[PDB]
Amino acid sequence: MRRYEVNIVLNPNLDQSQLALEKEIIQRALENYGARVEKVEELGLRRLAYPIAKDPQGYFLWYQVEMPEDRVNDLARELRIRDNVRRVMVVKSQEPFLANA
């Protein structure tokens, strides 16, 4: 079990039923791969610096987790199956290196 950050960028044009559904599916996927959720940041709609999936903007969520290492890659695969999820980036957690400090 290590400490990770799961980034998910999904389609901004979803309504509430839809978004809630993709989100719940994601929850289920984490629970299935044994990922405990330490904290969550959902920043939502933001303007991408380049268009992704013909959309100028995207919807952002961030999940800090602790999960089994061996499963992590697999977890990623699952999250990508959904069409509505444009980006998935899983990152091993790091301490906040500081500069001009």
Added chain:
Amino acid sequence: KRQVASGRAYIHASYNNTIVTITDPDGNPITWSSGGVIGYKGSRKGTPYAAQLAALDAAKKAMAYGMQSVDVIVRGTGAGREQAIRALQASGLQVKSIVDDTPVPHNGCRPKKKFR
């Protein structure tokens, strides 16, 4: 037979030749011109003068469609790139913005022996 009046002017400049394309604001070309469009044939098509005359021909053909404003998009490097921007500015078309778009790879493809 259009009445466009605002749009894009693309200047594609290589060492061999210079070509200009005047287009509508959503990207579809209206008129175009090049070194060879005006009488030049060989190496002579790469001179800055050719670029001048090509910009000017293109701007004429623009006036015929009733063009006024132009956003310039510059691609490539060759002689008379700047001469084409120049001629285009003093053409009677009033330019809005000039932009260098020259495409560069992130290193995809092997070049020909001449280019390595």
Added chain:
Amino acid sequence: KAKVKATLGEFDLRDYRNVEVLKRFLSETGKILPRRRTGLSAKEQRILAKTIKRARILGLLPFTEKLVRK
């Protein structure tokens, strides 16, 4: 010329999600600025590169831009 780091507070060089800061390390174009501009140390720079590239992958930062004037 005053370096990018010179105007900034204590800031995470590891935060790929923070655009408001990271933008200042890129040129007119999309390019990651040289140390001569960013004022960073070797290690600092080396981290900032990774962070930027991560953010780029996430669409939060541009891979390339276009040059005005000219």
Added chain:
Amino acid sequence: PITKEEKQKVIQEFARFPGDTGSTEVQVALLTLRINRLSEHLKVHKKDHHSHRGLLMMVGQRRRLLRYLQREDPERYRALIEKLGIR
């Protein structure tokens, strides 16, 4: 990999007396642990050579420690071998 308590369990197991982190017995034990791990990782990744060099080196070290133990106390050697499953 090999984590702290995974390793400690082995050190405790093979230590001669309390607080012995350094004895020939312990060094050999640890080396063996690493070796076996590496051998498992080389059953897959048969194409990873740079690690295989490491394997050769660790194997060498172990053989040196063993030849030394066997030279000094033969009984401790036989014991160590019986426990570990070497040779």
Added chain:
RNA sequence: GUGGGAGAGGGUGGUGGAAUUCCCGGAGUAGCGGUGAAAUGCGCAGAUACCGGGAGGAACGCCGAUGGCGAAGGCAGCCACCUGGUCCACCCGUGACGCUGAGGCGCGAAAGCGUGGGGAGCAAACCGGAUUAGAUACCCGGGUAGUCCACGCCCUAAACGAUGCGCGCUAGGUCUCUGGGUCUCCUGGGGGCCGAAGCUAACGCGUUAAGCGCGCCGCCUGGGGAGUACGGCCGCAAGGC
């Protein structure tokens, strides 16, 4: 052992953007391309230039260094996993357990071979264009193997620092990467440049020795003949020792 650290070190899987090519669509005419100049070539079955969409392969711009890692070959997008080496601090444990290393065994750029995939760009061979006394060559248009992946061979090289490995000893100055410290600086480990003593035929080397020493391995003995012949071993072959 504990506790820290930097890293294009390696293997597997996944993913991102720029560009080239091709296919689809719109818009749009008379050329484009290319050279010292040209021509072959491509374009009215609508090219080039411009916009949108799609497919596919290969390689990762800026960061990037005069930088880093590796035993060497060599290693550069990002992510995860599996894994090698190494540096520092603490002075904690073992108690000479060390160095080197004929043979052996393994790794070994590129090209090359075998079987099967893949194939965008480049491109030996080849097919053409022009230059020029001429052409098989330098320039131009095409183009197959190959370059890419899997597995199995091949074992070469300016495989270069043209400098075997290890340890101790012998002024400094300066730039730098990476640790620790009471951080003007000091101390440890790399990478460079000048230079003490000294060495060197000279050029140069000089705490990253080509100095002063010790241990062990490899190698040399005028040029050609010749890395040829014969023989042996290895290899499917090419061919290697």
